[PDB]
């Protein structure tokens, strides 16, 4: 196995070569491939000449475009503010679940708020071991007849672990971190031999401008500092006197034309403060406008002559996006100021001097100057993280990740070099971790910075708030949507995706505005931050809420999942169904499977629903399992047993009810099944005038009730399907859809011209055909998860937790960003 790293300079190639020799990672060999600039390396990776390189966030954006098609895969983790510990958040969530779902696991947290390594389930007496995330170590479960297991101690905090590593078993003459009671870094740190002291934030990162030799006064160190994003800053010497608003005509040093801290951040501020006569691509390029602002600068990668005048690279290396240009990068821009080739340098806080005293200070955009350690209040914005990138195909992602993980475990010299600073990686980097598997530049940079960088390259025409771009998931839906657009007078437009999850992505990225989602997709949609705008109201009995919008809805009419049993079986209750014979509509059905399996796993330590029951019939299971012993199959024996078709006699709503009456104790079905197949409503012989009063439903409290009281004695009611959109577009989508519905709904004024809830092109296109109307979602002041799902469903299916991962999109769309207001 090989990893080919692309280097951009003679110096970087030298450092990469040293690592080939010094860093011994078994199974994976590092190799180094030289190119003359950042852009030539991005092309080498696209072409397969190399596999990986580390990019500034600005280049991560550029590399994500179709010319290169690269994606970020590895980066240093950062924090925005202090958060609750995971155990305490989990406790709060589980305690907020539906109390009618009894016997649920409530985590046990220790005096620091972390998980006790031994976790126990009070209602079942089972205990197990967990990792620091509170996730069960599989295979450690012990029954209550046994003593609690012996579980390894918690992994130490960063500070306590670095302290243990610094001691290394018996220390003298080296820095040993000082930790607080909670195991985080004390704000002030001192070197036990040199007498120097400095400040660190809560995860131990040094605050620049605070390093203090012994015998001098230290700057005040801020406590509980969990803001670890990097900040773009403008650095100047204290010997000059101009302010930020007088930058016109000065000399400047920039980390690079494509760097976020050296270009996007200052240019964004220049434009907002109207220092730069530029607003759109009608006034030419921004680089040309910047060329007229400064008298002479060094901006590696630039083409304008005066913007390369201050660079000192020799011959063709001059003004290159490469360390062979001595003023390239954060530390090159600072050197350019230090050597008086510029009056101001644009870089980020992590490249500022560590020492408190000296001739440098910060140039604030509010026309003041402030000391180096005040960058959090004297900056040009937070900037995104930087990242290792590879091809979008990801053919080398695993080898790249494995090599860097092992190299860091072995403490290879990745993050420094005698040859120079910020070679291969930023010298300030301490750890590189894998990004979410579905991350891309949009989700890595965040929508605010992604759009901000795009705005510098093109005039982004923001779509109209009077048009709803509807996302369709198949060709018939696209065609029905084009007919809607033709009658809509411009209110409706159409986009195409392959599946509802890709529609959610389009809405997040501003390519579409709305889509209707099945219940099985709403957890993902809500975790990515979309909101229900309107919902499909399916109650055929009551049309009052459709005629008079905003009025009270007595019954929304969604299905209720119930546990159906016979009146003769007096001994069966909810709490004793273990080992009994059950009948499910099919695997994957929400009322017949997802809701029952969710409650069973919630109350029995995630024990398989296959193992919970004795002999069941659930179409879709393995034919040899206990879940297919009850399944008959085709009465016209061909074997089509336990099959997901009508060939199975026990398939579907009617089939699961047949399984109950013929050979079962309980059936998991919607509440409408028993009424639609008893009282002689089904002509077949198996239900020869079967009586509805012959059956009852099981309540979660062990009691029972007649099938008529399904509203108060059910496993869970389902939420309605929802039309989702971005938070800032809810009001527009509601307004446009309600107006369209007054024209083309079931009582629309122009329903002869178009019908939203039917089509000759197919069934359930865009909306479900049995929809009565769309009802505005009335957002309540509570968690959107509980608001949309209802507490019962939220608890039964997701344990009332925001930590479930039913789609691998969730870790990417919840990745946190370094954005400004
Ligand atoms: N805001 C809000 N309006 C309701 C409508 C349905 O009537 N849409 C939902 N998805 N909901 C879930 C229900 O929850 S439940 O607990 O009543 O089942 C609810 O009635 O609260 C509701 N929440």
Numbering used by the authors: 5 to 174, 177 to 644, 647 to 829
What's the paper's own text on this?
Dinoflagellates and cyanobacteria produce saxitoxin (STX) and ~50 congeners that disrupt bioelectrical signals by blocking voltage-gated sodium channels (NaVs). Here, we show that American bullfrog (Rana catesbeiana) RcSxph and High Himalaya frog (Nanorana parkeri) NpSxph sequester STX congeners using a ‘lock and key’ mode shared with STX. Importantly, functional studies demonstrate that Sxph ‘toxin sponges’ reverse NaV block by multiple STX congeners and detect these toxins in a radioligand binding assay (RBA) used for environmental testing. Taken together, the X-ray data and MD simulations highlight the structurally rigid, pre-organized nature of the Sxph binding pocket and identify a shared set of protein-toxin and water-mediated contacts that engage diverse STX congeners having affinities that vary by ~two orders of magnitude.
